[PDB]
Amino acid sequence: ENGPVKISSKVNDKQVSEFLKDENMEKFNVKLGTSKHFYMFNDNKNSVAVGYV
Amino acid sequence: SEVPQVVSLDPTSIPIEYNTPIHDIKVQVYDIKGGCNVEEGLTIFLVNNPGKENGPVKISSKVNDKQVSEFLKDENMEKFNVKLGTSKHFYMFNDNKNSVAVGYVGCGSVADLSEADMKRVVLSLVTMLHDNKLSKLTVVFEINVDKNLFRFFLETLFYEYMTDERFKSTDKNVNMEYIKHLGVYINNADTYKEEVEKARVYYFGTYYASQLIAAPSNYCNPVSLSNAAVELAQKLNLEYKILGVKELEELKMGAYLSVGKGSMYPNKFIHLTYKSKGDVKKKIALVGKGITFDSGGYNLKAAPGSMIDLMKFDMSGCAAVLGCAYCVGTLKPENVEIHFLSAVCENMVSKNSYRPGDIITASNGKTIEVGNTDAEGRLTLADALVYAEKLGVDYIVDIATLTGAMLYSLGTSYAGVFGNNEELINKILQSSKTSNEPVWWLPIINEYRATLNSKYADINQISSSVKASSIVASLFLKEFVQNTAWAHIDIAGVSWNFKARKPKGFGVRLLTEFVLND
Amino acid sequence: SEVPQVVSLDPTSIPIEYNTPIHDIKVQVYDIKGGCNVEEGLTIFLVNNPGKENGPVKISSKVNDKQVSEFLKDENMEKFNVKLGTSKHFYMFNDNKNSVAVGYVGCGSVADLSEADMKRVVLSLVTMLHDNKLSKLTVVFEINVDKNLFRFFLETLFYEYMTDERFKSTDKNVNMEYIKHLGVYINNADTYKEEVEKARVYYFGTYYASQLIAAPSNYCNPVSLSNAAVELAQKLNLEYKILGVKELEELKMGAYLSVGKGSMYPNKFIHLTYKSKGDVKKKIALVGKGITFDSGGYNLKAAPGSMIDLMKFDMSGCAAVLGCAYCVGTLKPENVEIHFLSAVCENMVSKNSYRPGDIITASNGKTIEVGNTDAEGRLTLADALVYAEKLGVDYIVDIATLTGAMLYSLGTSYAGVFGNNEELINKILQSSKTSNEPVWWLPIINEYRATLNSKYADINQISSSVKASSIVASLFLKEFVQNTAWAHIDIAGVSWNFKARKPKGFGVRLLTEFVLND
Amino acid sequence: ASEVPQVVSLDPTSIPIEYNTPIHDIKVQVYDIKGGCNVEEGLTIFLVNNPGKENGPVKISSKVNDKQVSEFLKDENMEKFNVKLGTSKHFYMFNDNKNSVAVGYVGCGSVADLSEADMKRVVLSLVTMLHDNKLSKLTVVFEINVDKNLFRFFLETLFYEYMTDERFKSMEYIKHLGVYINNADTYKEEVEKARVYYFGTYYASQLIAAPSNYCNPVSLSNAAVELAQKLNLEYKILGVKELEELKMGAYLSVGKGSMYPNKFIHLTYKSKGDVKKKIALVGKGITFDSGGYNLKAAPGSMIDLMKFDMSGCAAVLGCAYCVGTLKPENVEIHFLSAVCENMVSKNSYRPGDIITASNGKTIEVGNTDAEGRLTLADALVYAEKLGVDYIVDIATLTGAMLYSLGTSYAGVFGNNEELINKILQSSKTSNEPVWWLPIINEYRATLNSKYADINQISSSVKASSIVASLFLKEFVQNTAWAHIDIAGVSWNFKARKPKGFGVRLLTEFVLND
Numbered sequence A: 001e002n003g004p005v006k007i008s009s010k011v012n013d014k015q016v017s018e019f020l021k022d023e024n025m026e027k028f029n030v031k032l033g034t035s036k037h038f039y040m041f042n043d044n045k046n047s048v049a050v051g052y053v
Numbered sequence B, C: 001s002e003v004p005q006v007v008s009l010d011p012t013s014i015p016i017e018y019n020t021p022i023h024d025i026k027v028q029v030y031d032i033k034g035g036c037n038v039e040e041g042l043t044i045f046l047v048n049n050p051g052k053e054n055g056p057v058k059i060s061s062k063v064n065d066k067q068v069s070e071f072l073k074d075e076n077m078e079k080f081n082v083k084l085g086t087s088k089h090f091y092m093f094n095d096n097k098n099s100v101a102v103g104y105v106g107c108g109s110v111a112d113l114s115e116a117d118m119k120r121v122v123l124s125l126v127t128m129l130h131d132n133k134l135s136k137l138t139v140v141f142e143i144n145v146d147k148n149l150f151r152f153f154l155e156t157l158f159y160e161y162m163t164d165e166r167f168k169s170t171d172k173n174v175n176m177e178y179i180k181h182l183g184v185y186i187n188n189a190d191t192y193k194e195e196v197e198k199a200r201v202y203y204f205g206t207y208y209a210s211q212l213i214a215a216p217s218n219y220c221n222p223v224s225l226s227n228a229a230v231e232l233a234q235k236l237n238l239e240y241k242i243l244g245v246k247e248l249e250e251l252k253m254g255a256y257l258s259v260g261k262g263s264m265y266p267n268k269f270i271h272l273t274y275k276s277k278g279d280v281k282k283k284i285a286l287v288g289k290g291i292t293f294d295s296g297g298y299n300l301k302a303a304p305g306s307m308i309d310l311m312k313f314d315m316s317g318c319a320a321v322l323g324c325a326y327c328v329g330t331l332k333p334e335n336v337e338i339h340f341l342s343a344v345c346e347n348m349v350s351k352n353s354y355r356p357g358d359i360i361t362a363s364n365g366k367t368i369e370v371g372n373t374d375a376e377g378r379l380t381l382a383d384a385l386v387y388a389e390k391l392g393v394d395y396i397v398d399i400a401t402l403t404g405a406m407l408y409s410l411g412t413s414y415a416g417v418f419g420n421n422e423e424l425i426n427k428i429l430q431s432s433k434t435s436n437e438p439v440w441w442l443p444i445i446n447e448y449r450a451t452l453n454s455k456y457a458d459i460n461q462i463s464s465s466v467k468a469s470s471i472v473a474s475l476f477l478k479e480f481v482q483n484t485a486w487a488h489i490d491i492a493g494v495s496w497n498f499k500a501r502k503p504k505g506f507g508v509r510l511l512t513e514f515v516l517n518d
Numbered sequence D: 001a002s003e004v005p006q007v008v009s010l011d012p013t014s015i016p017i018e019y020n021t022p023i024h025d026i027k028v029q030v031y032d033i034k035g036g037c038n039v040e041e042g043l044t045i046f047l048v049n050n051p052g053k054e055n056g057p058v059k060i061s062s063k064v065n066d067k068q069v070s071e072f073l074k075d076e077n078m079e080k081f082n083v084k085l086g087t088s089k090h091f092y093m094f095n096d097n098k099n100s101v102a103v104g105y106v107g108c109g110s111v112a113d114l115s116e117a118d119m120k121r122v123v124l125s126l127v128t129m130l131h132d133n134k135l136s137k138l139t140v141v142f143e144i145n146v147d148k149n150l151f152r153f154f155l156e157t158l159f160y161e162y163m164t165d166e167r168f169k170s171m172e173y174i175k176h177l178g179v180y181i182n183n184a185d186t187y188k189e190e191v192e193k194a195r196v197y198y199f200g201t202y203y204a205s206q207l208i209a210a211p212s213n214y215c216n217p218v219s220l221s222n223a224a225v226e227l228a229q230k231l232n233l234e235y236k237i238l239g240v241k242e243l244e245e246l247k248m249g250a251y252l253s254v255g256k257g258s259m260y261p262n263k264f265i266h267l268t269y270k271s272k273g274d275v276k277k278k279i280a281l282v283g284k285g286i287t288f289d290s291g292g293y294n295l296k297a298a299p300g301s302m303i304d305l306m307k308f309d310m311s312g313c314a315a316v317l318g319c320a321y322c323v324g325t326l327k328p329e330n331v332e333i334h335f336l337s338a339v340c341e342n343m344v345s346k347n348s349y350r351p352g353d354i355i356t357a358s359n360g361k362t363i364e365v366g367n368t369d370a371e372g373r374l375t376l377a378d379a380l381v382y383a384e385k386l387g388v389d390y391i392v393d394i395a396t397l398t399g400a401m402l403y404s405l406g407t408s409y410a411g412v413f414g415n416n417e418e419l420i421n422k423i424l425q426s427s428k429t430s431n432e433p434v435w436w437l438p439i440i441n442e443y444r445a446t447l448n449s450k451y452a453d454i455n456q457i458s459s460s461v462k463a464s465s466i467v468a469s470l471f472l473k474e475f476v477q478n479t480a481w482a483h484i485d486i487a488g489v490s491w492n493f494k495a496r497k498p499k500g501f502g503v504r505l506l507t508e509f510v511l512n513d
């Protein structure tokens, strides 16, 4: 109940894959409706926004 | 001094949290003219754009990190705007190949932020702190604030960040993880450092009052509330005195005692005193309304909109006075003697309750005709004001959730102040500006005094005609201050925060600024 | 166990009539094929004419009397119609030169009689019994009824025929002369013979509950009601246990104890148990709401339409459970263990009452914020459900006059059932079908659960916005059943018969059918 | 002048207006108190007080040039009466010349400085004696201390309360008024100013007291034209077609359900010299406020009082009389009122309707009984288009004023500190009390409509007087603007008549600033 976030999908981007690591995503919980998004640069130095709900 | 019970499961004390997680936060203030270090936790820039209504974000501070500085370049930041309350999070790696979290909170397009604007900025910051297990928060002030507004930022941050879990059993937040360090970068840092610990003191005084108000009436009763006042005075080395029924019967406080006749909890009059080391130059009496629960009496709160379930907050005035007593006892001002007073009782329905129509005698000899048992606050305040003036003070200031009419005059943001002395009212307004607790001056219209003319008693408690309840109530209280500068703050409309479903602790910082800046 | 009094004239026990005159009626059921004998008393034919909306009455049964059969010829009977509720009386001499009385009651044109329709014909029959000093009544079934509807005919006949005179002093019987014999002619006398004594047991269980409900709150208080429950268990050789305040405090039943704090009568928890001599295959707990009077507390029932004068019926759930205890204790089913529970108390206004806003702790550790003292049924039920689940049963079924919103959903005829288990809900609906006490399944909408999220306590007692009170209350009750099949029957709309100004005894036969037909 | 529509031939088609009142025939004489008082004819009343002695005895200090009256006013005789505020006694006797005279006093309490409310009690006691006196002259001897402004207020209140409105009805008035007061020469210039201020207030009272069948949008605008013609003011009455061309959708929506077409009153006073200040005065002109489909049916809504919902318009028109008569210089004043009637009909606007104001802003109507701010919105847009320095509106806008300031003090809101200070200063010199209330910007978000540009009302915030001020603020873009809410102070419930509140306050604002 309100456990940590764990991303299981493989992301074909090293920068995003590092962001979605378990140690990083465990700081967020899965309570219904809770969400966070971050802005970052991907492998091609392009601005991307990644998050969860 | 120990609380009667109906069943053994009835609580016998108010749970009070003294050592809050806010007190465990190490606060450091650095000057911006030396670069910002982005290492651990979350770093938030408070940015604004004067003129350009929702203009782009521009970071002006020098960042001592090549990777982070490149991320924060204007070409990168131009996709975000500075709309008041808006916030964004950034993920990046710093020079040491470490993952860092950076972001901003929009502060609008006006250079001077109001207390409402700063509250909206702080609330956006708290949203970033919630549901995120960060260890450190760093705030970089790219906006323009004086010492008072900077302190207000810290108080509001501490207050909104704090979560009250005293009454949670099986539903405590499993993910509650407060930060342990707070870093602040601001121009001219040496001048702002003295506001940090003052904000921490102001925060807890407000939070302490919030703890007393939010505590339900079965936990917070006249006995348990006065017990907490003794414990607070003992921790601060203040003089304290609790007047019981036998003493109150002998001060002939018939108006105050009549209100509590129907309660299972005996009346308790709180009298805390802070005396200064050296020559006392100002003597001040602070009076707080202390109705631990206001059922209305036989004039029961049964009409639609009377909100009887909120009436645990009817001791908000007492809580504000007690919260001010903490700040004064901690900061220890000089050349001042302050009395913290509250005639605490409970307004209940019973065979022993006082009835509508009853004629009672105040401690100054004035007979009062009770027209409405739900107008009990002015009755308890009447005897408290007579007690206060007998101390021979320079100023008497009372604060009370007195009249629901405040919602139709000033609303939920501004409290009303009445008084018999222009200079004292000016000091209160003046303190409202520096404490950022808004207050508006309302008149004591003498033409309405005739509606309090009783046919049998000396004076009526209530008017049967005039609907200006806040003014008529002020006219009643004025009859119990004979020759002393007196002011009256009605906080019935501003005490409770209905959006957040929690008390505000309103009045603590205002009363403290009044005492400290005299 | 001793009822406290204010004055010596206060009653100390509930007058209960176990000996009803209905029990002195000798019932004989004969087969329609062997002919009907018309000798003494009144003989009534229940006639129907399908298709023909109000077509003529036609007696099809063979009458073993030449004189009577000639009168009952079709040419004579064609002047009467079969409209539902209509009735006629005939005077004649039989073969045998004796005066006899014959008549009929119209049963409409539909072949399948409703439970409401059967009540309407039965009420017409009782009117013929009233104001008539008859010694015997004979009913000739010229309609099609199954065993359950035939038993329902007898139960309803016995119930409406009986008149409660426990509280009449100077305005008593005068002309009250019950019949001593009841004859029934029907195809299958044989399978309907076993329904006679079952109807008599079901009748008294319903009438016993009606006696407790109709008993005013000065007669039926928490002490006197539990005393009557002990007396009933002793007469049926059931295990019984009444938990006093000291035991309830040790069990930490804070929600239940808070409701009764303002009462002069101590709380009493009723626990009756029926176990079979064989292997127990199913364990069932039946929970009844036992508010002997619901003033509403400080949320006083003062709004228009709140009907505070009816609130002696707020223990209808407890009365139904006790009435079911009589039926189960009398018929003695096998392979079943039944617990009869009721957290009995009184909701009053006093200096000792619990207040709106109070935070109380249930026996499962959950803290509850009281938003309305008039929502006290769910507070007492919360601790009763925790107690019930601790017994380790297969089914928990509670019945309560919980929410007035039932009048706007299902009305005065159909009760609502909520639950967390489809199999239990289906069994309740099946027993509702066989007992002919109508119940309708209503949903527990989980989207409304968020409105019970308290800011300070674990859960809110009430929702402040959603007006679907029957569903919100069901959401509250669900929080106190963790891992057991549970159903909740709200009888607030169907408990009282306003046309007849008397209780219905609703739920006795439904709960008994549920236990027996498992 | 348009034609007033009727349902039946017995419906009135004009408002009866009394221009030449008996007050205008009263010759006022002011003498200095230091020369003694002559008691020869009529009724002589002394205004006496006793400082310190709470309800102390009456003591006459002035020398009266009559032996019989002097004996009557001796200390031994007057000590039997007390000076409690409002208490009065008058006696009838023969003077030295064997003429019937009436002598008496009115108690002025124990405080030296009388408030405007205190002066009202003294005047009301005086008027009670005048309504029971067939004598030809009344003489008032001021043995108390009043400044020039309060003395003028005394005369205005005396004239106003003395006058009796008998227009709807199917003692004799005095012909002379004598006043004895210290420094008579400085108070003499206030006499004719009080008479002008009196009629401006009484004229407004006649319009307010006139029932809604007599005072309708057509008949009220006709009366404004007749008044403007008598005062040589420029006038212009905008009809529905012109209002449609000006796209006054908010104002027109309120009057859709009325049988009387909307009429926009625009009077102008220009000075002969160089115009240095331009002022626009806007008055709410709802001739009857039934509430619309949000009908005033709740207990205490007082639908029978709602003929007074044009009190703001009456105050502006009453100010037009004072300005047109006194003729100030270097000023150009516009008198505006968007007059209509809020009724229930198949043609009425509905709760939830979205309408478009003349400045393009779409408004979502949440309550048809909040119609004053809708008509004021279009009137404020009209006012700012005139290019004035100050816009001051006066309106019976919010019933919440009864719970904030009550029935004595009106509330003033605004967007400009200098204008609020001028209004507060005019309230002090006119003795019509007003209190400054804040426009709390934190409440502005509650007017954010989901579909329209702005909400007409808040569904949550109960600070209705402040919320209404926030709505009005959205229709003044770049002009100093003030708003006076007189919903609580317009009607005198004890006397069952209007007060004419705002006439003297608005006139002093024009004359002094």
Ligand SMILES: CC(C)(C)C(=O)N[C@@H](C(=O)NO)c1ccc(-c2ccc(CO)cc2)cc1
Pocket (backbone or CB within 6 Å): B294, B296, B305, B306, B307, B372, B374, B375, B376, B377, B378, B401, B402, B403, B404, B405, B407, B469, B492, B493
């Ligand atoms: C005599 C009279 C006019 C009934 C009165 O003023 N009563 C007092 C009182 O009960 N004791 O002073 C009172 C105090 C506060 C409120 C109040 C405040 C905010 C809210 C939030 O909706 C709801 C209610 C209502 C009433």
Ligand SMILES: CC(C)(C)C(=O)N[C@@H](C(=O)NO)c1ccc(-c2ccc(CO)cc2)cc1
Pocket (backbone or CB within 6 Å): C294, C305, C306, C307, C310, C372, C374, C375, C376, C377, C378, C401, C402, C403, C404, C405, C407, C462, C469, C492, C493
């Ligand atoms: C929370 C709220 C909305 C106050 C509530 O649901 N209250 C309960 C209650 O008191 N539970 O303990 C309640 C139960 C029954 C009736 C009721 C039933 C039939 C009739 C006959 O017309 C009249 C009244 C009213 C109220």
Ligand SMILES: CC(C)(C)C(=O)N[C@@H](C(=O)NO)c1ccc(-c2ccc(CO)cc2)cc1
Pocket (backbone or CB within 6 Å): D289, D300, D301, D302, D305, D367, D369, D370, D371, D372, D373, D396, D397, D398, D399, D400, D402, D457, D464, D487, D488
């Ligand atoms: C609808 C809302 C927002 C509550 C409102 O404020 N409505 C206005 C209005 O009708 N505006 O057009 C309003 C104006 C005056 C009174 C009023 C004044 C005095 C008296 C006598 O005591 C009785 C009633 C009531 C209401």
Ligand SMILES: [Zn+2]
Pocket (backbone or CB within 6 Å): B294, B296, B373, B374, B375, B376, B377
């Ligand atoms: Zn109260």
Ligand SMILES: [Zn+2]
Pocket (backbone or CB within 6 Å): B291, B294, B314, B374, B376, B377, B401, B402
């Ligand atoms: Zn109170």
Ligand SMILES: [Zn+2]
Pocket (backbone or CB within 6 Å): C294, C296, C373, C374, C375, C376, C377
């Ligand atoms: Zn209840």
Ligand SMILES: [Zn+2]
Pocket (backbone or CB within 6 Å): C291, C294, C314, C374, C376, C377, C401, C402
């Ligand atoms: Zn109940």
Ligand SMILES: [Zn+2]
Pocket (backbone or CB within 6 Å): D289, D291, D368, D369, D370, D371, D372
């Ligand atoms: Zn209106």
Ligand SMILES: [Zn+2]
Pocket (backbone or CB within 6 Å): D286, D289, D309, D369, D371, D372, D396, D397
């Ligand atoms: Zn209006």
